[PDB]
Design an enzyme around this catalytic site. Structure first.
Site, PDB file in Angstrom:
ATOM      1  N   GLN A   1     -36.301 -31.046  -1.636  1.00 33.46           N
ATOM      2  CA  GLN A   1     -36.972 -31.085  -2.940  1.00 33.46           C
ATOM      3  C   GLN A   1     -36.171 -30.243  -3.943  1.00 33.46           C
ATOM      4  OE1 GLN A   1     -40.450 -28.495  -4.839  1.00 33.46           O
ATOM      5  NE2 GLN A   1     -41.262 -29.773  -3.187  1.00 33.46           N
TER       6      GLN A   1
ATOM      7  N   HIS B   1     -35.621 -28.732  -8.221  1.00 33.78           N
ATOM      8  CA  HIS B   1     -36.190 -28.374  -9.517  1.00 33.78           C
ATOM      9  C   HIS B   1     -35.312 -29.109 -10.528  1.00 33.78           C
ATOM     10  CE1 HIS B   1     -37.712 -24.109  -8.176  1.00 33.78           C
ATOM     11  NE2 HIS B   1     -38.603 -25.051  -7.930  1.00 33.78           N
TER      12      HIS B   1
ATOM     13  N   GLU C   1     -39.180 -31.656  -8.966  1.00 34.14           N
ATOM     14  CA  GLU C   1     -40.184 -30.968  -9.754  1.00 34.14           C
ATOM     15  C   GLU C   1     -39.671 -30.424 -11.076  1.00 34.14           C
ATOM     16  OE1 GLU C   1     -41.065 -27.253  -7.805  1.00 34.14           O
ATOM     17  OE2 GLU C   1     -43.014 -27.079  -8.801  1.00 34.14           O
TER      18      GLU C   1
ATOM     19  N   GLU D   1     -47.982 -29.852  -6.505  1.00 31.50           N
ATOM     20  CA  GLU D   1     -47.674 -28.889  -5.457  1.00 31.50           C
ATOM     21  C   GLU D   1     -48.096 -27.444  -5.737  1.00 31.50           C
ATOM     22  OE1 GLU D   1     -43.423 -27.489  -5.206  1.00 31.50           O
ATOM     23  OE2 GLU D   1     -43.657 -28.068  -3.103  1.00 31.50           O
TER      24      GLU D   1
ATOM     25  N   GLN E   1     -46.626 -25.372   0.401  1.00 30.68           N
ATOM     26  CA  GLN E   1     -45.334 -24.847   0.003  1.00 30.68           C
ATOM     27  C   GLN E   1     -45.442 -23.348   0.266  1.00 30.68           C
ATOM     28  OE1 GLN E   1     -42.418 -25.016  -3.771  1.00 30.68           O
ATOM     29  NE2 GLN E   1     -44.453 -24.301  -4.392  1.00 30.68           N
TER      30      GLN E   1
ATOM     31  N   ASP F   1     -36.239 -21.738  -2.833  1.00 29.21           N
ATOM     32  CA  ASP F   1     -36.290 -22.210  -4.208  1.00 29.21           C
ATOM     33  C   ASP F   1     -36.321 -21.099  -5.256  1.00 29.21           C
ATOM     34  OD1 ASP F   1     -38.688 -21.225  -3.315  1.00 29.21           O
ATOM     35  OD2 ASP F   1     -39.940 -22.801  -4.152  1.00 29.21           O
TER      36      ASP F   1
ATOM     37  N   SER G   1     -38.006 -26.138  -1.262  1.00 27.87           N
ATOM     38  CA  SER G   1     -39.107 -26.688  -2.035  1.00 27.87           C
ATOM     39  C   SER G   1     -38.734 -26.359  -3.474  1.00 27.87           C
ATOM     40  CB  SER G   1     -40.448 -26.035  -1.654  1.00 27.87           C
ATOM     41  OG  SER G   1     -40.440 -24.632  -1.871  1.00 27.87           O
TER      42      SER G   1
HETATM   43  K   LIG Z   1     -41.497 -26.405  -5.553  1.00 28.36           K
END
Ligand SMILES: [K+]
Ligand code: CNC
Ligand code: CNC
Ligand SMILES: [K+]
Ligand SMILES: [N+]
Ligand SMILES: [N+]
Ligand SMILES: [N+]
Ligand SMILES: [N+]
Lengths: 137, 178, 551, 551, 137, 176
Positions: free
Chosen positions: C141, C143, C170, C221, C296, C335, C362
């Site tokens: 995942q 950003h 995200e 999330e 998460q 992250d 994440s």
């Molecule tokens: K995240």
């Protein structure tokens, strides 16, 4: 009824999936969107679908996930703005015990959302005990 | 002690002010922000910024919570313009507005170590414009990927210390600035 | 006199990191604290009367929620009596099936599972994680943000991210009111990169749900939960309000997971004298109890707290292990920034990268960190080549792949053009051909022309106030010369009608095929079993730039 | 038009590293090559007639040596018939004891054990390594050199390294003739840092043994072996000449191990079309057959070969695992530069650091790399702080500890003093007081006064030509006012007299206490068992500089 | 024979050890080194000690290591310079078959090094076949 | 260039220095690991030798591509006993007869760091030794990133020159 072998529904039993306005997955085409034969109001997951996924979650050994889906199934009948009001009412110091019980009666009498209604009453009771109602801050 | 509690703060009655709400340890157990800037200097700049815009500044100390969002909320409930500025002892600042969700805001300054006396000035300046129903340009964003690596641990310690002064149910005290 | 050896060391980036000695009374200790409660449970007539030392008379909202819905009471007493060392052994034993373990872990109390994993070293935890991971296939995942909330750049960076391999992406906003634009830009760009990539726009709780209700997101999330009642309270929620919110997302057919992370209670002032790991365990059970499919965790945004004290990074791997062991999808952090040292941040990442989790990171930053609106990620765009090299070096599938500049340029360009058509079609502030070109070859917002934020925010807010939904985006695309993208967008919307991607670890791959823990069962049983990097996927990972043919 | 995203990536250090596509024909492939022979063995009247598809008639010297001395024939056929996947499973299974595995792994053919470990991913390999490691306690080895072969600096750096935790230290020379000086300097400085630290001076085979006969070294490690006959020949040896040399060292009471490493045959021109791992397996068996107790492997000096190809770093861990699996002490490399990237070199180091090996690094540079005469180490003096921080982060014992500047300075100075007296007593080119203070506060040779190399070069070759032994060092110290150091010298000779430290993995800790695989047995059986970082050692690792007390 | 239970010899049975001049590890102090009551002739590991360690290695399940120590025990009788001579003779292209067999005979008859002698003879035969004798390069 | 010419022999006079090049130097390969052409290299090596008033000879070795051995085949035919080994990829060493094969007077283990000026300094030192002198050892060159950048290329280049090795073939004299 539904089990792991019936998942994914889209692949195994697509016909089992219909929308709130009784539309089919195949009805959602670019053609129908452009001509407005289908609209946002037609694109809404049904309580039947969520209850099917609940059964699958249970078969997969995930009871709480299934319970979450059962609640979601009842909430499909509740309008967007009402969903937001109820969520906010459950946050710290927002409501009085009676307002929460009123939300619960409403959920039950107007939406038949019995599970969610019980959920709210449970919160009401514990909110008094843990002082999370309006005026307790 | 450049701050004196003069009694429970009452709600403003006109759209002529902006409330500066500070944490329960501001100017007391702690007197400088996370990077050494004195609380006396910070409050001085915020006030000058507000007044410079033809708006009054009223300071109060909040006790029900040390969280900057709720500190600010206590301030916007009493502000005559509905506008408030929350400030924790470590420096974190937020511009709130009566009516908005506690965790929503007009402007937020989430990296205290990057704030300067000039930033604190523009903040007071912008708070005032909001009070006068003007749509000012947001204070330029201040961001640095190493702010957390260098100061998060310190931030947690300073907040732990200020939080010991939280008093549930205790209403805000208006403050007289020396 | 000064030692030149120590003057050199003093200048090292790692010495700029924040370190602190343990402060047990305030919970500033990662794990294994003498204040943590001894595991225990007492049940009378089907109801818990004691949970990990605490009597029901003293239960807070968290204890009540966990005691009533987070533990399988039918086997709780049986498991409690089992030896924690044996249980920890079972976790890393390659011959004890995941299916044999879950029935036991889900019957453990928060203190019990913490006791179990605390007997392990990181090697044992990784050995266990590869087996306990819910989805057989690991994922990633990213950003996708920028300091200017530039929509054109968001779409381009999003297309590149999806092309590189991220299955979830995200975004968030530097300026609140920009939200709608960011969300639409992220969704459009992601579908251009790879149809199926799920998108989210992290905002204030009520605001995010509303955005989802309008159809501009695929999942949520940052639905927070906390480990102590006072902290949860400053977080403006209770286990019940968050549990309701979870079902609300599901009632709209939207996938979602909660978010937590060790050190948040310390950062927020009330650790109630407990270690970060124990409190995080409470968050993990709150998630299980709410019926939320995933979480998460792994400190996330509060990584500066556990990393400051001993065994903090080991504690981070531990909380991820607990999450997976309790049969929950785990978006394993990696992250957020916590160090100035490349050596240190790499060690922290490998804990999850080597064994593989549902989402290794994440929030790997798909943009250079200066554009990361989550205050910086543990990895950013400039680390892409290093990440691929390590994948190749160790034969580990980290979820990403080497890519051609020519392909990225085309993909970013198509994303910018598609969004240009979207804005023109919906009557939003224009995206110029100059902007399309800049986004195509940009590295970050420093390479993008400045936009009129006043005009953007005005129309962005109008999207919310006038309830302009996702079908408006579909139409603009189909009417603007992007029928292909319009179909892919409609397809992602149709996923909200089946409920299939609402299940544990669900992502959407290939031709709209859902891939979750239900139909992609992790079947690890030691060497040569379970998921293995091989075949064409291995060939893809081997093809890094600079690999010249010896001949 | 260029993508700024790619221009930024092109500047990254990792892209300066050498990468190449696999070249199977020339053996430029790390492991799992289709050219590698299928495992097989045939025994008649207790003698091997077939080895890995090859008949005895076609055996080269390596095959003969391995076939006659390197395999436990009593169970060779039994283990050959066992499934390799099952065997790999047994390797990482925490519940299959090391003592139950050793009788089986030592009975495998080189191709067999290679096939076995190749079924594993890096997590499984680490899970197995922690169990197969011969010595229960992990250790570390450091390089102590400088570009000027400066004696005074070598002594100072040697003392610090020993003070930081290294149990073995190695030096070499830019100018061969300088050898004698480097050694004496290393030995004296090491004992000053911590009595018991073993020292070596890596040189041409014949030359090093001589230096050892003179009593100027504690052990030898760079006793090379190679995987193909042509390469071994250019290495100027045969399995028999090196086997004789191994026994020669032991006859003089000197501990020793062989050295090898994946990629050497490729670097030297004759891989006979086999993978690096297979050829390294032959080297490990050569070592076993010769009766040598340990081996320095994991590519070592040829690290730029396997790292250039896919799964090369995984192959390096596999060769370390095979070494330990064959009941041999493993000094696991992590001593040579292969990358310009901090991220990449950390991933490579963790493979051994996390599980722990007899010597995590077989040459961590205790001096800044510009001073490293082994062409640079994977870690150097400037990484000391990061290394201690990672130990603390993961609660892993890396063998080193945080130190105080005042202590180092004090230790550094005493070493320069001790060595100064030695040169005075033996009548060697004097060591001015200026050099003593410089070496005391120096970080590298750049902070040291230039000496007359030609003058020393003549006195260096004099010691060897005039067979001047270490007793002149013991006396030159006694008279100089250095009794304890002088005595510590004898204690080393005393250890050589007992033969205890000649055993597998032997090092000397505390008050001349031997710590080997014989009296420090690794009894790993899963979580909570085997070596566990705790007690005083844990406290030592937690106490890093900069750790500020919150209250 | 010595077993693992007898290890370390320095801690369990110091008396079992000695040196190339018969005495004790105790007599190895700086004092005796200065007065020269102990010299280099006194600091050489003995074959007796190596055979003890060989027995321990065997007991520890390491037969090859034991064999190595056995060959070492034999080599303690061979002078340093001769050791270097034999080592070099075994390197590639250094000797003729006859010269190697001569080394073996000498090892066995002059030093009683039977194991090492066999080791050298073995090398000589294989050196002929694999062509590693003088002139084969 | 480098004309074949018959086989080489002993010297008898210590006023010379032999230069032994690998079995590909000037043939399959014409430049070192970093581009410096063999021509230039050999030129500066000879100049540095003759500069010291010493004579320089050049021979090609075929029995082994290993620089140490290539130098050995030469220090046995050199009247001065000193020689210089140079592989096509650049690696160079100053060897002396009577010394162990893997030992030497001076070694240059990092070819990428050598310059045409370095090759000339190696020459004078070689001839310096031929005159039984103790010259200052050529300044040590050490770059910790030499291996990360060139070791892979080094192996490939040596693998190629090694294909020209021929067992039992004596060194052939060379005329530039
Ligand atoms: K995240
Ligand atoms: C660490 C962090 C961050 N967070 Co939070 N957060 C957190 C954690 C600490 C918060 C705390 N109160 O202790 C954590 C995980 C608990 C959290 C939680 C939340 N956060 C939230 C949001 C929306 C945001 N967070 C950011 C500030 C987002 C930041 C990203 C960014 N661009 O800065 C962030 C990554 C880094 C800030 C930092 O470390 N600064 C360095 C430190 C040395 O300076 P500091 O001044 O001491 O930092 C403090 C403030 O940042 C403050 N704070 C953090 N988040 C918020 C949110 C709001 C609304 C307010 C008023 C303050 C904060 O807490 C820090 C420690 O005391 C945000 C910019 C990220 C984004 N763009 O999505 C955004 C704020 C947007 C805005 N309002 O303008 C939540 C509402 C999420 C949710 N789904 O509920 C929630 C609010 C909790 C609360 N009651 O305060
Ligand atoms: C990698 C390496 C290194 N090695 Co070796 N080595 C090796 C390996 C590859 C060499 C090869 N023949 O292919 C390896 C393991 C096989 C090896 C072996 C040996 N090496 C040896 C020694 C002593 C040394 N080696 C170094 C050069 C020591 C180097 C340290 C240093 N300061 O450079 C070193 C760490 C790095 C060199 C490099 O990568 N350069 C970069 C590359 C791009 O440049 P290049 O010009 O192509 O490099 C070549 C030369 O360095 C050459 N070479 C390497 N070692 C030697 C030794 C001698 C005697 C000679 C003539 C050449 C070499 O091989 C390289 C590849 O072709 C040394 C300075 C440091 C050390 N102790 O390790 C030292 C030389 C001492 C001196 N003369 O002052 C051995 C004699 C050890 C032994 N126990 O037998 C042995 C010789 C083998 C042989 N017949 O050539
Ligand atoms: K070493
Ligand atoms: N959220
Ligand atoms: N947490
Ligand atoms: N050596
Ligand atoms: N090797």
């Amino acid at each position: 009824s539904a089990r792991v072998s019936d998942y994914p529904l889209a692949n195994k039993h697509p016909e089992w999936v219909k929308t709130a306005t009784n539309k089919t997955l195949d009805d959602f085409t670019l053609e129908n969107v452009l001509s407005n034969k289908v609209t946002a109001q037609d694109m809404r997951i049904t309580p039947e679908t969520l209850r099917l996924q609940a059964s699958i979650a249970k078969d997969a050994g995930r009871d709480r996930l299934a319970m979450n889906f059962e609640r979601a199934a009842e909430l499909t009948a509740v309008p967007d703005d009402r969903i937001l009001e109820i969520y906010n009412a459950l946050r710290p110091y927002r409501s009085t015990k009676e307002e929460l019980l009123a939300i619960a009666d409403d959920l039950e009498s107007r939406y038949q959302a019995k599970i969610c209604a019980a959920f709210v009453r449970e919160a009401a009771t514990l909110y008094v005990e843990r002082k999370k109602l309006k005026g307790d801050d | 002690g450049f701050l004196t509690e003069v009694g429970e703060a009452r709600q403003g009655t006109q759209q002529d002010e902006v409330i500066i709400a500070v944490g329960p340890a501001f100017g007391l157990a702690q007197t400088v922000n996370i990077v050494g800037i004195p609380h006396k200097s910070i409050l001085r700049e915020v006030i000058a910024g507000i007044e410079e815009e033809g708006i009054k500044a009223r300071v109060i100390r909040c006790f029900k919570s040390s969280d900057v969002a709720f500190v600010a909320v206590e301030g916007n409930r009493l502000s005559g313009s509905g506008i408030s500025i929350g400030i924790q002892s470590k420096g974190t600042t937020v511009i709130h507005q009566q009516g908005l969700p506690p965790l929503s805001n007009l402007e937020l300054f989430p990296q205290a170590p990057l704030l300067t006396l000039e930033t604190y000035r523009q903040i007071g300046k912008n708070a005032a414009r909001y009070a006068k129903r003007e749509s000012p340009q947001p204070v330029p964003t201040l961001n640095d990927q190493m702010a957390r690596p260098k100061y998060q641990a310190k931030s947690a310690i300073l907040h732990i210390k200020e939080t010991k002064y939280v008093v549930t149910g205790k209403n805000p005290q208006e403050l007289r600035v020396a | 006199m000064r030692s030149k050896r120590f003057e050199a060391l003093a200048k090292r980036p790692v010495n700029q990191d924040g370190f602190v000695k343990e402060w047990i009374e305030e919970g500033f200790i990662a794990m294994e604290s003498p204040n943590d409660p001894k595991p225990s449970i007492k049940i009378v007539n089907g109801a818990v009367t004691e949970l990990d030392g605490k009597p029901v008379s003293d239960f807070d909202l968290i204890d009540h929620f966990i005691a009533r819905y987070g533990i399988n009471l039918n086997r709780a007493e049986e498991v409690m009596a089992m030896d924690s060392v044996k249980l920890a052994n079972m976790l890393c034993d390659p011959n004890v099936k995941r299916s044999e373990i879950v029935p036991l872990t889900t019957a453990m109390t928060p203190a019990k599972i913490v006791e179990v994993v605390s007997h392990m070293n990181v090697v044992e935890m990784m050995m266990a994680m590869q087996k306990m991971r819910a989805r057989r296939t690991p994922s990633q995942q990213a950003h996708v943000t920028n300091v200017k909330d530039n929509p054109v750049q968001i779409a381009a960076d999003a297309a590149e991210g999806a092309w590189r391999g991220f299955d979830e992406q995200e975004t968030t906003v530097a300026v609140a009111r920009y939200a709608p634009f960011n969300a639409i830009a992220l969704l459009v760009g992601s579908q251009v990169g790879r149809p199926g990539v799920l998108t989210q726009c992290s905002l204030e709780e009520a605001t995010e749900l509303k955005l989802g209700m309008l159809g501009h997101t695929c999942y949520a999330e940052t639905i927070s939960v906390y480990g102590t009642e006072p902290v949860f309270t400053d977080g403006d929620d209770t286990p019940w309000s968050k549990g309701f919110l979870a079902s609300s997302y599901a009632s709209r057919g939207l996938k979602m997971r909660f978010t937590s992370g060790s050190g948040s209670e310390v950062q927020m002032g009330y650790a109630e004298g407990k270690s970060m790991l124990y409190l995080e365990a409470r968050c993990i059970y709150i998630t299980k109890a709410a019926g939320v499919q995933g979480l998460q965790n792994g400190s996330v945004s509060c990584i500066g707290v556990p990393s400051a004290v001993p065994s903090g990074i080991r504690a981070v791997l531990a909380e991820n292990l607990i999450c997976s062991s309790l049969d929950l999808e785990c978006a394993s952090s990696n992250d957020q920034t916590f160090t100035h040292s490349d050596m240190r941040r790499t060690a922290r990442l490998l804990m999850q990268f080597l064994p593989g989790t549902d989402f290794i990171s994440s929030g790997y930053s798909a943009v250079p960190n200066y554009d990361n609106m989550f205050a910086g990620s543990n990895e950013d765009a400039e680390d892409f080549d290093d990440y691929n090299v390590i994948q190749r070096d160790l034969k580990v599938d980290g979820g990403l792949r080497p890519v051609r500049e020519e392909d990225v340029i085309a993909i970013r360009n198509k994303a910018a053009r598609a969004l240009q058509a979207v804005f023109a079609g919906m009557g939003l502030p224009p995206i110029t051909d100059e902007e399309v070109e800049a986004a195509t070859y940009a590295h970050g917002s420093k390479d993008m022309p400045e936009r009129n934020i006043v005009e953007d925010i005005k129309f962005a807010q109008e999207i919310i106030n006038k309830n302009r939904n996702g079908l408006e985006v579909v139409k603009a695309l189909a009417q603007g010369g992007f029928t292909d993208v319009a179909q892919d967008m409609l397809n992602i919307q149709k996923a909200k009608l089946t409920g299939d991607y609402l299940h544990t670890s669900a992502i959407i791959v290939g031709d709209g095929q859902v891939l979750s823990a239900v139909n992609d069962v992790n079947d690890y049983a030691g060497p040569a079993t379970g998921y293995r990097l091989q075949g064409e996927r291995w060939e893809e990972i081997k093809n890094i730039p600079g690999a010249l043919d010896p001949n």
